[PDB]
Every structure is written in structure tokens, then in C-alpha cells.
Amino acid sequence: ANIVGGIEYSINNASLCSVGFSVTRGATKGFVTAGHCGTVNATARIGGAVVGTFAARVFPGNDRAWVSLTSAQTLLPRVANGSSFVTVRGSTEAAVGAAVCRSGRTTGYQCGTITAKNVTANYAEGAVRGLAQGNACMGRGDSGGSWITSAGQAQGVMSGGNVQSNGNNCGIPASQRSSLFERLQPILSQYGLSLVTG
């Protein structure tokens, strides 16, 4: 499969999440995603085919993971925006107030701004600390997906948000949205990963 930020993958033939970013770990191909999406050794599929397995994850406390891929996968420095692509150019962290977008299999490509940092989410499994917050909308299934600026600086991966009874927060105003992402930089250093760029 071609590995593009925002696309759907399944975990152990059950849950669906979204790809974060193509990465390498030496000769090993991978993608980063959210930790709550899968447990270590869980099998990832795209287009019905096995593409790899969860190599490592921290959740709760943090919310991060990477999936180690078979050599047959094609890593791409891209995030889905409809039928088009945003090129991944680096991982410069944007400040509060910056515009940012996110990509995932449920709500697609959505934009907003970064509204806060160092936010704690209290999930059913426990607290996750240190999250960044934006007001781009999102929904169930977007977890793991890319957060990236329009200039191509990868920000993080989708963790969670204040979804409403329809499964998303797109039906409430931006001023009322809390859409939380795990910062990319600590994921890259914790696992020794390099971002695939173009």
C-alpha cells in the first residue's frame, strides 16, 4: 500500500484509525499514529492487506505509537487533502495562534487554529497530558491522523476531542471545539524515527 497521512487502516480486523505520518527507523519503514489505536504486535491492514504491526505505543499518559511496515509498503511524504496532497516538509512546531489542518478517515481534511498547549484529557482509560489543542473539527475514527500546517510542517497526531452525539464536533462552532493532538516531536525522539519529507 501507499502510506499517506490521513488514510484509513484497521487494527486486528476491528477498529479503524487514521495514518499519521510516514517515517523511517534506519532501514525499517513505518508510520506514526495514536497509541490508543492499538496494542504492541497488533496487525495493521490497509485495503484489506496486512501492511505491518504495532511496534511500540504509550497510552494513556501519552497517546502515541508507531507501526512497523513490511518492506513492500511505499512511504510517501504526503497527507491527504481530498483527492490532493499536502507535502510534508518538516516538523517545525507551530505556536499557539497558528493556523493548522488535520486529516483523517471520518471527517477528511479540516482546518482551524492552535488554541492551547499542555492540555490534559481525561479519557476512560486514564489521563493523557501534554496535548496540544486546536479548533479544527474531527470525529470518531480520525484518531491517529495527521495534524499539519498548510506550509507542510507536521505538528502531531489526532488523540481525541469533544465529540457530540453525532460522533464529531463539526456541528458546533469553532469557539466551542476542543480537538486534541499529541505533539510529533516527542514521538520521533522516543522511537528514533525520521520523518519522510518531500
Side-chain angles (χ1 to χ4, degrees), residues 5 12-13 20 29 32 42 44-45 52 66 68 70 77 81-82 93 98 103 111 117-118 124 135-136 172 175 191 197:
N12 289 335
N13 264 326
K29 300 182 181 185
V32 295
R45 293 175 174 80
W66 76 287
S68 174
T70 73
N81 168 11
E93 185 168 345
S103 186
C111 302
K117 290 188 179 187
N118 207 24
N135 65 13
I172 63 178
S175 62
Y191 298 126
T197 64

PDB file of all heavy atoms in Angstrom, residues 5 12-13 20 29 32 42 44-45 52 66 68 70 77 81-82 93 98 103 111 117-118 124 135-136 172 175 191 197:
ATOM      1  N   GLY A   5      -0.566  10.248   4.985  1.00  0.00           N
ATOM      2  CA  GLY A   5      -1.229  10.724   6.187  1.00  0.00           C
ATOM      3  C   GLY A   5      -2.724  10.906   5.984  1.00  0.00           C
ATOM      4  O   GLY A   5      -3.161  11.420   4.947  1.00  0.00           O
ATOM      5  N   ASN A  12      -6.178  -5.281  13.966  1.00  0.00           N
ATOM      6  CA  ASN A  12      -6.667  -6.630  14.259  1.00  0.00           C
ATOM      7  C   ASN A  12      -8.062  -6.872  13.679  1.00  0.00           C
ATOM      8  O   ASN A  12      -8.913  -7.506  14.304  1.00  0.00           O
ATOM      9  CB  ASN A  12      -6.604  -6.929  15.759  1.00  0.00           C
ATOM     10  CG  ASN A  12      -5.185  -7.112  16.261  1.00  0.00           C
ATOM     11  OD1 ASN A  12      -4.273  -7.473  15.509  1.00  0.00           O
ATOM     12  ND2 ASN A  12      -5.005  -6.907  17.555  1.00  0.00           N
ATOM     13  N   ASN A  13      -8.274  -6.377  12.456  1.00  0.00           N
ATOM     14  CA  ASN A  13      -9.527  -6.569  11.737  1.00  0.00           C
ATOM     15  C   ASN A  13     -10.735  -5.981  12.455  1.00  0.00           C
ATOM     16  O   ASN A  13     -11.875  -6.395  12.210  1.00  0.00           O
ATOM     17  CB  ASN A  13      -9.748  -8.061  11.432  1.00  0.00           C
ATOM     18  CG  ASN A  13      -9.283  -8.449  10.047  1.00  0.00           C
ATOM     19  OD1 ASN A  13      -9.381  -7.662   9.107  1.00  0.00           O
ATOM     20  ND2 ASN A  13      -8.805  -9.680   9.906  1.00  0.00           N
ATOM     21  N   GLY A  20      -0.862   8.692  10.655  1.00  0.00           N
ATOM     22  CA  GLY A  20      -0.280   9.994  10.989  1.00  0.00           C
ATOM     23  C   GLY A  20       0.702  10.441   9.921  1.00  0.00           C
ATOM     24  O   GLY A  20       0.391  11.283   9.070  1.00  0.00           O
ATOM     25  N   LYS A  29      10.711   0.709   7.594  1.00  0.00           N
ATOM     26  CA  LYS A  29       9.632   1.612   7.215  1.00  0.00           C
ATOM     27  C   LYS A  29       8.568   1.636   8.308  1.00  0.00           C
ATOM     28  O   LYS A  29       8.314   0.615   8.945  1.00  0.00           O
ATOM     29  CB  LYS A  29       9.017   1.135   5.897  1.00  0.00           C
ATOM     30  CG  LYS A  29      10.002   1.096   4.741  1.00  0.00           C
ATOM     31  CD  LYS A  29       9.352   0.669   3.452  1.00  0.00           C
ATOM     32  CE  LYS A  29      10.362   0.612   2.330  1.00  0.00           C
ATOM     33  NZ  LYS A  29       9.753   0.319   0.998  1.00  0.00           N
ATOM     34  N   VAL A  32       3.728   6.788  12.096  1.00  0.00           N
ATOM     35  CA  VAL A  32       3.284   7.166  13.426  1.00  0.00           C
ATOM     36  C   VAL A  32       1.774   7.338  13.437  1.00  0.00           C
ATOM     37  O   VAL A  32       1.150   7.674  12.425  1.00  0.00           O
ATOM     38  CB  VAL A  32       3.988   8.439  13.972  1.00  0.00           C
ATOM     39  CG1 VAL A  32       5.474   8.168  14.171  1.00  0.00           C
ATOM     40  CG2 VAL A  32       3.773   9.657  13.112  1.00  0.00           C
ATOM     41  N   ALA A  42      -0.196  -5.680  17.468  1.00  0.00           N
ATOM     42  CA  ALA A  42      -1.466  -5.688  16.744  1.00  0.00           C
ATOM     43  C   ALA A  42      -1.200  -5.490  15.252  1.00  0.00           C
ATOM     44  O   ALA A  42      -0.279  -4.767  14.870  1.00  0.00           O
ATOM     45  CB  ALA A  42      -2.396  -4.616  17.267  1.00  0.00           C
ATOM     46  N   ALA A  44      -1.865  -4.238  11.468  1.00  0.00           N
ATOM     47  CA  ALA A  44      -2.435  -3.149  10.684  1.00  0.00           C
ATOM     48  C   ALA A  44      -2.721  -3.625   9.273  1.00  0.00           C
ATOM     49  O   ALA A  44      -1.874  -4.276   8.661  1.00  0.00           O
ATOM     50  CB  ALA A  44      -1.467  -1.976  10.636  1.00  0.00           C
ATOM     51  N   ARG A  45      -3.907  -3.279   8.769  1.00  0.00           N
ATOM     52  CA  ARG A  45      -4.283  -3.548   7.379  1.00  0.00           C
ATOM     53  C   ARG A  45      -4.725  -2.269   6.678  1.00  0.00           C
ATOM     54  O   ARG A  45      -5.348  -1.399   7.282  1.00  0.00           O
ATOM     55  CB  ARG A  45      -5.414  -4.572   7.288  1.00  0.00           C
ATOM     56  CG  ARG A  45      -5.028  -5.970   7.731  1.00  0.00           C
ATOM     57  CD  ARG A  45      -6.232  -6.898   7.724  1.00  0.00           C
ATOM     58  NE  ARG A  45      -5.867  -8.286   8.012  1.00  0.00           N
ATOM     59  CZ  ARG A  45      -5.635  -8.782   9.224  1.00  0.00           C
ATOM     60  NH1 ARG A  45      -5.730  -8.024  10.297  1.00  0.00           N
ATOM     61  NH2 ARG A  45      -5.323 -10.064   9.365  1.00  0.00           N
ATOM     62  N   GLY A  52       1.662  -4.215   8.290  1.00  0.00           N
ATOM     63  CA  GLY A  52       2.633  -4.164   9.359  1.00  0.00           C
ATOM     64  C   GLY A  52       2.002  -4.429  10.698  1.00  0.00           C
ATOM     65  O   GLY A  52       0.861  -4.891  10.790  1.00  0.00           O
ATOM     66  N   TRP A  66       3.939   3.780  16.932  1.00  0.00           N
ATOM     67  CA  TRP A  66       4.330   3.618  15.544  1.00  0.00           C
ATOM     68  C   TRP A  66       4.125   2.177  15.113  1.00  0.00           C
ATOM     69  O   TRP A  66       4.206   1.238  15.909  1.00  0.00           O
ATOM     70  CB  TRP A  66       5.743   4.145  15.254  1.00  0.00           C
ATOM     71  CG  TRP A  66       6.894   3.292  15.706  1.00  0.00           C
ATOM     72  CD1 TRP A  66       7.331   3.094  16.982  1.00  0.00           C
ATOM     73  CD2 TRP A  66       7.763   2.537  14.863  1.00  0.00           C
ATOM     74  NE1 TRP A  66       8.423   2.271  16.985  1.00  0.00           N
ATOM     75  CE2 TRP A  66       8.710   1.911  15.694  1.00  0.00           C
ATOM     76  CE3 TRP A  66       7.838   2.333  13.483  1.00  0.00           C
ATOM     77  CZ2 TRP A  66       9.710   1.093  15.192  1.00  0.00           C
ATOM     78  CZ3 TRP A  66       8.841   1.534  12.984  1.00  0.00           C
ATOM     79  CH2 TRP A  66       9.764   0.916  13.838  1.00  0.00           C
ATOM     80  N   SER A  68       5.400  -0.611  12.475  1.00  0.00           N
ATOM     81  CA  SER A  68       6.491  -1.074  11.646  1.00  0.00           C
ATOM     82  C   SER A  68       5.896  -1.798  10.442  1.00  0.00           C
ATOM     83  O   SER A  68       5.027  -2.660  10.595  1.00  0.00           O
ATOM     84  CB  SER A  68       7.369  -2.002  12.485  1.00  0.00           C
ATOM     85  OG  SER A  68       8.392  -2.612  11.751  1.00  0.00           O
ATOM     86  N   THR A  70       6.019  -3.688   6.437  1.00  0.00           N
ATOM     87  CA  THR A  70       6.821  -4.559   5.601  1.00  0.00           C
ATOM     88  C   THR A  70       7.538  -3.733   4.526  1.00  0.00           C
ATOM     89  O   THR A  70       7.130  -2.618   4.179  1.00  0.00           O
ATOM     90  CB  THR A  70       6.006  -5.680   4.945  1.00  0.00           C
ATOM     91  OG1 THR A  70       5.197  -5.124   3.903  1.00  0.00           O
ATOM     92  CG2 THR A  70       5.141  -6.411   5.967  1.00  0.00           C
ATOM     93  N   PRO A  77       5.878  11.258   1.461  1.00  0.00           N
ATOM     94  CA  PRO A  77       5.925  12.475   2.280  1.00  0.00           C
ATOM     95  C   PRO A  77       4.680  13.327   2.071  1.00  0.00           C
ATOM     96  O   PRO A  77       4.774  14.497   1.676  1.00  0.00           O
ATOM     97  CB  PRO A  77       7.163  13.188   1.743  1.00  0.00           C
ATOM     98  CG  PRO A  77       7.138  12.847   0.293  1.00  0.00           C
ATOM     99  CD  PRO A  77       6.687  11.417   0.234  1.00  0.00           C
ATOM    100  N   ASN A  81      -5.530  15.522   1.284  1.00  0.00           N
ATOM    101  CA  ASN A  81      -6.446  16.660   1.302  1.00  0.00           C
ATOM    102  C   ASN A  81      -7.436  16.440   0.164  1.00  0.00           C
ATOM    103  O   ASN A  81      -7.172  16.816  -0.979  1.00  0.00           O
ATOM    104  CB  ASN A  81      -5.685  17.970   1.100  1.00  0.00           C
ATOM    105  CG  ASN A  81      -6.598  19.151   0.832  1.00  0.00           C
ATOM    106  OD1 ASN A  81      -7.811  19.065   0.985  1.00  0.00           O
ATOM    107  ND2 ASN A  81      -6.015  20.247   0.378  1.00  0.00           N
ATOM    108  N   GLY A  82      -8.553  15.794   0.457  1.00  0.00           N
ATOM    109  CA  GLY A  82      -9.446  15.375  -0.615  1.00  0.00           C
ATOM    110  C   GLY A  82      -8.697  14.444  -1.548  1.00  0.00           C
ATOM    111  O   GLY A  82      -8.072  13.478  -1.091  1.00  0.00           O
ATOM    112  N   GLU A  93       7.588  22.965  15.076  1.00  0.00           N
ATOM    113  CA  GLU A  93       6.400  23.120  15.898  1.00  0.00           C
ATOM    114  C   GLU A  93       5.866  24.557  15.773  1.00  0.00           C
ATOM    115  O   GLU A  93       6.635  25.516  15.907  1.00  0.00           O
ATOM    116  CB  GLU A  93       6.734  22.767  17.350  1.00  0.00           C
ATOM    117  CG  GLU A  93       5.538  22.777  18.279  1.00  0.00           C
ATOM    118  CD  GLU A  93       5.802  22.160  19.640  1.00  0.00           C
ATOM    119  OE1 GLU A  93       6.823  21.465  19.810  1.00  0.00           O
ATOM    120  OE2 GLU A  93       4.965  22.376  20.539  1.00  0.00           O
ATOM    121  N   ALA A  98      -1.344  29.828  15.546  1.00  0.00           N
ATOM    122  CA  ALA A  98      -1.089  29.413  14.169  1.00  0.00           C
ATOM    123  C   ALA A  98      -2.290  28.680  13.582  1.00  0.00           C
ATOM    124  O   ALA A  98      -2.988  27.943  14.275  1.00  0.00           O
ATOM    125  CB  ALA A  98       0.123  28.507  14.103  1.00  0.00           C
ATOM    126  N   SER A 103      -6.084  15.669   9.035  1.00  0.00           N
ATOM    127  CA  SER A 103      -6.583  14.756   8.018  1.00  0.00           C
ATOM    128  C   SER A 103      -6.889  13.409   8.649  1.00  0.00           C
ATOM    129  O   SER A 103      -6.097  12.896   9.443  1.00  0.00           O
ATOM    130  CB  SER A 103      -5.508  14.612   6.941  1.00  0.00           C
ATOM    131  OG  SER A 103      -5.965  13.839   5.847  1.00  0.00           O
ATOM    132  N   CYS A 111      -9.546  22.393   8.834  1.00  0.00           N
ATOM    133  CA  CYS A 111      -8.601  23.399   9.285  1.00  0.00           C
ATOM    134  C   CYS A 111      -9.172  24.254  10.402  1.00  0.00           C
ATOM    135  O   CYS A 111     -10.393  24.358  10.600  1.00  0.00           O
ATOM    136  CB  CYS A 111      -8.116  24.255   8.120  1.00  0.00           C
ATOM    137  SG  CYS A 111      -7.334  23.293   6.783  1.00  0.00           S
ATOM    138  N   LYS A 117      -1.796  24.788  24.507  1.00  0.00           N
ATOM    139  CA  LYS A 117      -0.845  23.695  24.662  1.00  0.00           C
ATOM    140  C   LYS A 117      -0.885  23.167  26.093  1.00  0.00           C
ATOM    141  O   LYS A 117      -1.488  23.786  26.984  1.00  0.00           O
ATOM    142  CB  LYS A 117       0.566  24.142  24.271  1.00  0.00           C
ATOM    143  CG  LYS A 117       0.686  24.374  22.768  1.00  0.00           C
ATOM    144  CD  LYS A 117       2.093  24.620  22.295  1.00  0.00           C
ATOM    145  CE  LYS A 117       2.109  24.815  20.782  1.00  0.00           C
ATOM    146  NZ  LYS A 117       3.487  24.899  20.258  1.00  0.00           N
ATOM    147  N   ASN A 118      -0.257  22.014  26.297  1.00  0.00           N
ATOM    148  CA  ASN A 118      -0.157  21.368  27.610  1.00  0.00           C
ATOM    149  C   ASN A 118      -1.512  21.057  28.255  1.00  0.00           C
ATOM    150  O   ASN A 118      -1.687  21.194  29.472  1.00  0.00           O
ATOM    151  CB  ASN A 118       0.740  22.157  28.569  1.00  0.00           C
ATOM    152  CG  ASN A 118       1.367  21.268  29.616  1.00  0.00           C
ATOM    153  OD1 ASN A 118       1.518  20.060  29.421  1.00  0.00           O
ATOM    154  ND2 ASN A 118       1.734  21.858  30.738  1.00  0.00           N
ATOM    155  N   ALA A 124     -11.436   7.505  29.346  1.00  0.00           N
ATOM    156  CA  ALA A 124     -11.903   6.378  30.155  1.00  0.00           C
ATOM    157  C   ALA A 124     -10.751   5.557  30.732  1.00  0.00           C
ATOM    158  O   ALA A 124     -10.856   5.051  31.850  1.00  0.00           O
ATOM    159  CB  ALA A 124     -12.832   5.484  29.361  1.00  0.00           C
ATOM    160  N   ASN A 135      -8.933  24.004  17.064  1.00  0.00           N
ATOM    161  CA  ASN A 135     -10.373  24.122  16.871  1.00  0.00           C
ATOM    162  C   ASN A 135     -10.845  23.709  15.480  1.00  0.00           C
ATOM    163  O   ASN A 135     -11.986  23.964  15.109  1.00  0.00           O
ATOM    164  CB  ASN A 135     -10.885  25.506  17.271  1.00  0.00           C
ATOM    165  CG  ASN A 135     -10.354  26.603  16.395  1.00  0.00           C
ATOM    166  OD1 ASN A 135      -9.787  26.342  15.338  1.00  0.00           O
ATOM    167  ND2 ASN A 135     -10.556  27.850  16.815  1.00  0.00           N
ATOM    168  N   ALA A 136      -9.978  23.038  14.727  1.00  0.00           N
ATOM    169  CA  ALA A 136     -10.427  22.234  13.589  1.00  0.00           C
ATOM    170  C   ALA A 136     -11.332  21.127  14.118  1.00  0.00           C
ATOM    171  O   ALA A 136     -11.059  20.579  15.189  1.00  0.00           O
ATOM    172  CB  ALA A 136      -9.234  21.622  12.870  1.00  0.00           C
ATOM    173  N   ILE A 172     -20.766  22.018  15.961  1.00  0.00           N
ATOM    174  CA  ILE A 172     -20.719  23.112  16.919  1.00  0.00           C
ATOM    175  C   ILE A 172     -19.687  24.126  16.425  1.00  0.00           C
ATOM    176  O   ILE A 172     -18.791  23.777  15.654  1.00  0.00           O
ATOM    177  CB  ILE A 172     -20.406  22.622  18.364  1.00  0.00           C
ATOM    178  CG1 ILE A 172     -19.014  21.978  18.447  1.00  0.00           C
ATOM    179  CG2 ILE A 172     -21.482  21.654  18.841  1.00  0.00           C
ATOM    180  CD1 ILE A 172     -18.612  21.525  19.843  1.00  0.00           C
ATOM    181  N   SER A 175     -15.401  28.023  18.231  1.00  0.00           N
ATOM    182  CA  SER A 175     -15.163  28.539  19.580  1.00  0.00           C
ATOM    183  C   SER A 175     -15.480  27.535  20.691  1.00  0.00           C
ATOM    184  O   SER A 175     -15.017  27.702  21.826  1.00  0.00           O
ATOM    185  CB  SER A 175     -15.977  29.815  19.809  1.00  0.00           C
ATOM    186  OG  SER A 175     -17.355  29.542  19.706  1.00  0.00           O
ATOM    187  N   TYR A 191      11.119   7.164  19.708  1.00  0.00           N
ATOM    188  CA  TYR A 191      11.304   5.940  18.930  1.00  0.00           C
ATOM    189  C   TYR A 191      12.436   6.012  17.913  1.00  0.00           C
ATOM    190  O   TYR A 191      12.654   5.067  17.180  1.00  0.00           O
ATOM    191  CB  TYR A 191       9.970   5.541  18.288  1.00  0.00           C
ATOM    192  CG  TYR A 191       8.893   5.247  19.314  1.00  0.00           C
ATOM    193  CD1 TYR A 191       7.670   5.896  19.271  1.00  0.00           C
ATOM    194  CD2 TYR A 191       9.115   4.339  20.343  1.00  0.00           C
ATOM    195  CE1 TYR A 191       6.679   5.625  20.195  1.00  0.00           C
ATOM    196  CE2 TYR A 191       8.136   4.078  21.291  1.00  0.00           C
ATOM    197  CZ  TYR A 191       6.914   4.710  21.206  1.00  0.00           C
ATOM    198  OH  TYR A 191       5.929   4.448  22.129  1.00  0.00           O
ATOM    199  N   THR A 197      10.151  13.253   4.161  1.00  0.00           N
ATOM    200  CA  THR A 197       9.840  14.600   3.688  1.00  0.00           C
ATOM    201  C   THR A 197      10.041  14.707   2.184  1.00  0.00           C
ATOM    202  O   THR A 197      10.689  13.855   1.559  1.00  0.00           O
ATOM    203  CB  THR A 197      10.670  15.677   4.402  1.00  0.00           C
ATOM    204  OG1 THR A 197      12.054  15.498   4.090  1.00  0.00           O
ATOM    205  CG2 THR A 197      10.468  15.609   5.912  1.00  0.00           C
TER     206      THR A 197
END
